[PDB]
């Protein structure tokens, strides 16, 4: 069973669908904050407009941002690194 690649892609798509709804409209915000918090990331390269709107809603609560808030880990890359086993 489970192939790393299809799951990584499913997770990204699930993240992407919540990030979209979280902006245009929630359970979606809750999911987005959980992903940002758990994975330590904020939006995605693949979704720049969505991603610029994040601060407007405080979907990416800083805390560790002490010099700038401009720079972010990409959630897609966090998702791939989770399944690749690179985040330890």
């Amino acid at each position: 069973f489970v192939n790393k690649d299809q799951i990584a892609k499913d997770v990204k798509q699930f993240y992407d669908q919540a990030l979209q709804q979280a902006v245009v409209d929630n359970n979606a915000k809750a999911v987005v904050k959980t992903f940002h918090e758990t994975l330590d990331c904020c939006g995605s390269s693949t979704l720049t407009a969505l991603t610029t709107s994040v601060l407007k809603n405080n979907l990416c609560p800083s805390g560790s941002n002490i010099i700038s808030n401009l720079f972010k880990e990409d959630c897609h890359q966090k998702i791939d690194d989770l399944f690749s086993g690179k985040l330890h």
Partner: single-chain antibody, 229 residues
Framework: VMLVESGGGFVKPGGSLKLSCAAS????????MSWVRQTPEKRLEWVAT????????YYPDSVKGRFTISRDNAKNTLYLQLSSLRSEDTALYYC?????????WGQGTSVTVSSGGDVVMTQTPLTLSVTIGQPASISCKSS???????????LTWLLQRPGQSPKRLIY???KLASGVPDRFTGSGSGTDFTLKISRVEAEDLGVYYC?????????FGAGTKLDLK
């Protein structure tokens, strides 16, 4: 503990070099890393930033398309490919976890480009000449408010001692960094900011810079040199 750059050199206009930076002693893969360059006239310029995982890269317009920042987390190395080099690119290029929680700098590797072989930050004065024990006060003003939607005011002060790399001194306007003595005080708000030294000691001499991190691109003040009368 350690960042060590190499790869710089003497290159012809239109030429190409690739800089690297070997990191050790901290959790590199989770550190958003930057390159910052220091020109022959001693301005600091932000060149590039890359996320921990390498998925997000950021560049100011002056280098965008010409320079490529990358990293190899398994080798604990940070890279900067330079191309279409020109004479205004001549600088000391520092590796630094500039925007990270820990403030770490390499020692710079130089690029000299030679056939021979945005928010404005205004720092006054350009040089303040002092006597040991006498108090100091340096000003830095921005052309736009540094107060983010965030609620935080990303104004940073750094100091570069003679022969050293720059060092974060204070962040978010007033909060001191690790090991900074209490005779430094940072104040200000909106577009006006001040660094005051109670009592100048010989460890305080060098060039102070302010840095704003609210508006893209990152920008620095031109620097105030503190020296002796």
């Amino acid at each position: 503990v350690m960042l060590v750059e190499s790869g710089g050199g003497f290159v012809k206009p239109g030429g190409s070099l690739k800089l690297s930076c070997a990191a050790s002693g901290f959790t590199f893969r989770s550190y958003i890393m930057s390159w910052v360059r220091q020109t022959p006239e001693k301005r600091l310029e932000w060149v590039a930033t890359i996320s921990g995982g390498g998925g997000n890269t950021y560049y100011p317009d002056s280098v965008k398309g010409r320079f490529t920042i990358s990293r190899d987390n398994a080798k604990n190395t940070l890279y900067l490919q330079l191309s279409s080099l020109r004479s205004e690119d001549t600088a000391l290029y520092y590796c630094a976890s500039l925007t990270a929680v820990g403030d770490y700098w390499g020692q710079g590797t130089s690029v000299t480009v030679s056939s021979g072989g945005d928010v404005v930050m205004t720092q006054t004065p350009l040089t303040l000449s002092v006597t040991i024990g006498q108090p100091a006060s340096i000003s830095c003003k921005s052309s736009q408010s540094l107060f983010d939607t965030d609620g935080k005011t990303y104004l940073t002060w750094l100091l570069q001692r003679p022969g050293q790399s720059p060092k974060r001194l204070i962040y978010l306007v007033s909060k001191l960094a690790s090991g900074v003595p209490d005779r430094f005080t940072g104040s200000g708000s909106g577009t006006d900011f001040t660094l005051k030294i109670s009592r100048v000691e010989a460890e305080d001499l060098g060039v102070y810079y302010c840095l704003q991190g609210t508006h893209f691109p990152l920008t620095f003040g031109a620097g105030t040199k503190l020296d002796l009368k």
